Amino acid sequence: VVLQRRDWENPGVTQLNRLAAHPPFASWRNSEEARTDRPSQQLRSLNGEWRFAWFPAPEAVPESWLECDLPEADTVVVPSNWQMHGYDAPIYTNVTYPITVNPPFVPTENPTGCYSLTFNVDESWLQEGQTRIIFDGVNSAFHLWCNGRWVGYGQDSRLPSEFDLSAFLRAGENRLAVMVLRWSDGSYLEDQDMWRMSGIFRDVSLLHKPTTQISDFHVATRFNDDFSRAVLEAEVQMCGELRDYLRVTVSLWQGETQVASGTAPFGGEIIDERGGYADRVTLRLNVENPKLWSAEIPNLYRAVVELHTADGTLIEAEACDVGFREVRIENGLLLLNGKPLLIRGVNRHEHHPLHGQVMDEQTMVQDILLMKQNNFNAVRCSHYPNHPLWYTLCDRYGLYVVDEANIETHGMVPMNRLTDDPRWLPAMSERVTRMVQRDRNHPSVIIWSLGNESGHGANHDALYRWIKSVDPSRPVQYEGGGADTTATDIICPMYARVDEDQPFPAVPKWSIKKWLSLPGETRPLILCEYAHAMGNSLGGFAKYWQAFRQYPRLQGGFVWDWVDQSLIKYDENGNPWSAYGGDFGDTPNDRQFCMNGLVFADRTPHPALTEAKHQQQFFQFRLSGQTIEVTSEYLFRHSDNELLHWMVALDGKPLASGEVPLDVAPQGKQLIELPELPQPESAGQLWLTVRVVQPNATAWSEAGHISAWQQWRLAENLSVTLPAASHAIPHLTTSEMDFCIELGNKRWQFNRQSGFLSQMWIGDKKQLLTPLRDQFTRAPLDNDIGVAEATRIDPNAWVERWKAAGHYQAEAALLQCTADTLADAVLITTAHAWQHQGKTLFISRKTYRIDGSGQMAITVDVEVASDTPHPARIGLNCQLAQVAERVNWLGLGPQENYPDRLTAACFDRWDLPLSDMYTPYVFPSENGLRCGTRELNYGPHQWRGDFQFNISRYSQQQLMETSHRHLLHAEEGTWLNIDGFHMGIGGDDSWSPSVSAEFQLSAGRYHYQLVWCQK
Amino acid sequence: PNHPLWYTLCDRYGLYVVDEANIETHGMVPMNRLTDDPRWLPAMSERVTRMVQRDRNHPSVIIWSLGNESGHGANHDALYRWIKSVDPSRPVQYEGGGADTTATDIICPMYARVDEDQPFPAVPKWSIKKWLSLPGETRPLILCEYAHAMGNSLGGFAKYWQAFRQYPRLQGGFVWDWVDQSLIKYDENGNPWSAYGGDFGDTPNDRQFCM
Amino acid sequence: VVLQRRDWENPGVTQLNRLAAHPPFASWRNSEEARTDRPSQQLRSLNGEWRFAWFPAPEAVPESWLECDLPEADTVVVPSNWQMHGYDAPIYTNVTYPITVNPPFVPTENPTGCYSLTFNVDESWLQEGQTRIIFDGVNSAFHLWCNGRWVGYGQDSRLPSEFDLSAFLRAGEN
């Protein structure tokens, strides 16, 4: 019958004998436990060691397994994904379905997980009431047997499936048998861009309820105009036998204080001609001056729902955290408690590099802490309902949540093929309706989402209206079909750019500024996805935030995304390395596209995270003469855990510092006048830095937390004093092959065949391993690479244009190499042409001036042919002989920064270990650049000028040639890249050119100057 | 939905048709117990979607109905929007939950009187003249059922028609109903007679209310 | 499977193997016949004399009935309501359900109409294309078998239920 019906190939059967969905239950039999959220003896965990056997198909499972343990089975921890235990390979595919697209059919080879548990049930649980099993997450579908008897069936990987086991259990030893199918008709609705895994990956629990029970409860909070009065409305539903003596009490608590209470017998108001709900009641509680919930101040109350008898005997209690907040759209603005939100959001998948898609509390808290510490106030559940604890944590820590239905049909052609099909409406409706029924009481959830990347079908319109009808308290959004369809309250595009239109047919991505004012358009715009943080990315992130702040109806967005979906593999010596698509024999696959995070999989930050933090700052600063103006972007809180540290430094040398307490009302301004600063004697640029510091620890941060910072140039004194002339004079030695410059024991060698500084000497120690040459290329970032365009690779991608123009193959041709003796210096003049098969790409003209002081002044003038694609960089490189421990620089830092991602970096004197000047991106690329650098120190060398640089033990060539970071080997000496100019990194998306025009090297003629000397 | 030939005949002879989904849950307590329940949405959706897919090409079909006497539930709102989305060419009506809910483009009460209010709790039947001008109301009013023609009836039929002609937004209605649902039985003499509820041993029954 | 699954007591199962709904089809192989709305050779009526046996419950139906005619069956006109042929009583109730309100369950004593038809199919219909059966209205739910083999299931008394019979039919008698 089970093998005969094939319920996993029928979108009309999404469950059999599954109980109704509901908010989180614990069936407390003690009111104080419910109030204080203590554990409940009526809610047991079945997590721990289970038995597991893997089969290639459900037809291969022996019938004996229903009755007793398979000797061949292993003992595994549950929850788990079975790919994480190595029973088969996890698959990384983005858009293309991991199975042949033939709905509703799945492959006959369907990996099957056979889970079983032998466990005790006490007779007291069976003597009365109802015992149910709860599977919080099973991927992708499953049948359930209890003591050899079939119980039911479930689909939807991301919401709990519950079954009444009351008639199946015996007192004493019981056995569960769970047959989990990797593929089902549900998989067609689960095409999210992530690892495709399977198994019992979320909690399993047993819940005992009395026969007469609270079956559902809904909490709403409505307010007066100024939010000084609230009504809390609680609708309560029961199951079992109705009796006149039954009562529902709802009490509301602030800490240990009961704030309000209401009691009523069952019997709802008249609904229609047939009467009302005899099995429901609605309690209304008045609350004066409620403490309001926000991400800023997550004020929470506790509501306790008691089912009891008139004489005061408790039957059972349930409870939830209540956050008094109103979400509404009015006049084109999304308001929370009357105030326009600015969403500092991120998309977050549930991912662990060891445990796969199994979530644990520690990882969840770590993510929330890091989010809040980096000025995020909002998270999108991309693209499925989360582990239930996630919402409890967001309620308490204070984050705005977009709860999203587990529906994505990205790989369909066209994308709406299923979602326009009425045959798929039931299956889609359950994914939406069961999420709402589960999560509707969480205050952190402020917006519902209908799913992701499933086009726009009539099924979306139906389910949009269903949500609007059952829950008017939360806007509904959905991006599919062009981001502004009739199924969305919010214009919610993905990767729409700030100023640049991308007018695709049918589904254009308008520039976000333009989008708001299209004829007839009134809604708020919040990007559901933007700033694709794949690898070295988040270029142009500041452009988004400038527009967010300037335009009221641009209310932010959610970065894609939080955490790299890299998985851990082990080499022969047991050393872990980070793996991505294809590393498990999974094919077809989308390689490194699973890694788009602001943090690595182990939650170590990428440099891009600091740019996010800075741009999402909650205080804005302006400087006018002596006065600093601080503006608060908080909506609800005063700045009561904030002080402003200011610091004035001359070229990194502190000159004055101080601190002022911040007392800024929400949306307010404070004026801080600095003291009149003493005049510095020496030349250089004064820099003002201000930090906002949180003196007191919070639930989410340590004492001393820096939340905001800003820098300005103050007065500059130009160096006018003549460098007191040295008496020494360098000597020119000329041979046919070389120009050699000599000063004391210092020697500079210029090769006359190549035209490059080929070697330098201090005494008898060589300084270079490779000659100092021009470099116009970088090891391609993920943004440079893009995607494959079916029959070939996209010719529009930066890497493809560079390769086609012969940038990586370009060979230097010497045009001129001359030497001149001056009064107190030797002048070397060179010119090179870089050519590809007869076409001149670049001309470099250099002068090298070596004087008595031992300094070599390099002047570089470059012509770039207007018809060659703009080059990745205009700079010089060499492999230095020395490996030193520290790198010291006066410039932007301390972290990696690029021309379109350097707003977070500060100008100062920085000192780091060499290893910190390399960014360990899992997919290797150009990395570790620091911009606006005036002085660089490494070992015996000092370079001065105005440049960008990176420095590491890996050549651009190796980075370019290596697919994984663990495969990188330190080279002899140290590779130095010094750029006069470096192209932006982009990142608006990672599958098309995204470097903005002002960050491309398009000027045609470039000049930079550099001084190389010994320090 | 009717036998498919009905719509062909209405196309050709010329009658305006309200096509109505096969959903009536009158005997539930309260009336919307199933239609507000998301577990019943799939079964309900099929009765609406499959009607629209069958009948959408008939010119005689000018209005879609979501069913009859099933209260007002969230499933009605979903299915109302589904129809507006797939077929913008036809208004959608539904009488349940008070005749003027968010699930109807047309105020479509049953047995609302001309001048007399019937102020039932939750689901009042206002006078039709009064209903039109209720604060914020703009929709046309067309009675889905009026003038209950049971036996010696249609008293005051003129009163409806006077109002229909006078008020532009009173655009008429559908009499209840066309044909007596009596069945033929045979006695001892083998002579046919007209039978109603109870006459087949059927019990409980509602007697002559089928006529 | 059929008696075990009890699809008639499950609001999540409204059909099995039923084809998508669509506007009226006739599948004319001649454009002029289509234009003039004349009969189509590809649309046959199965109305007429069928075999029928009444049972008090689906459990009471003999397995043999799938394979061959039941001797106790009567020959009846279809389309028909079996109450009009006197097999059980038609019930007139207005609001109150004729069954106990206990959704989704129905009485165990659930009158069951066992219809059958022996009919012929042209060999040409089977050598090419797709042959479907169309039930314009069946009240209130039904399972369908063809040549002893289970085809599918349908609900909603007032809309056509269509099933693909191509793999079930043989040339000649079915």
Ligand SMILES: CC(C)S[C@@H]1O[C@H](CO)[C@H](O)[C@H](O)[C@H]1O
């Ligand atoms: C590559 C695009 C055509 S689809 C693109 O893929 C991304 C890869 O991280 C994300 O999954 C985005 O949501 C999706 O729009």
Ligand SMILES: CC(C)S[C@@H]1O[C@H](CO)[C@H](O)[C@H](O)[C@H]1O
């Ligand atoms: C008797 C009323 C309470 S219900 C009333 O019954 C009528 C009897 O013909 C019709 O069926 C109407 O549609 C219905 O509203």
Ligand SMILES: [Mg+2]
């Ligand atoms: Mg299925």
Ligand SMILES: [Mg+2]
């Ligand atoms: Mg996708």
Ligand SMILES: [Mg+2]
């Ligand atoms: Mg704990």
Ligand SMILES: [Mg+2]
């Ligand atoms: Mg059924």
Ligand code: NA
């Ligand atoms: Na804004």
Ligand code: NA
């Ligand atoms: Na991705």
Ligand code: NA
């Ligand atoms: Na590489």
Ligand code: NA
């Ligand atoms: Na009129």
Ligand code: NA
């Ligand atoms: Na009647």
